[PDB]
Amino acid sequence: QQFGRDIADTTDAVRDPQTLEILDITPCSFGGVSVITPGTNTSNQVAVL
């Protein structure tokens, strides 16, 4: 085997050449950005989730 696949059609692991070892590939982090705001009247200070 040269590379591994998940239950879905996505690659989960690979056989790294130059060392013949197994490397797990994780989709690098991503996410939505939400803004906690009490309201323009209450305060302009906001938090980022």
């Binding site: 085997q1 590379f3 591994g4 696949r5 998940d6 692991a13």
Partner: protein, 36 residues
């Protein structure tokens, strides 16, 4: 033939998953011509 003639379809590695593929395979329990 019983349950023989199955080969790895590719160099893809799969762990604890069921995979369905359509390739040239020997049918299960098929008649196989045997010679001495």
């Amino acid at each position: 033939s019983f349950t023989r003639g199955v080969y790895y379809p590719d160099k893809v590695f799969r762990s604890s998953v069921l995979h369905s593929t359509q390739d040239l395979f020997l049918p299960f329990f098929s008649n196989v011509t045997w010679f001495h």
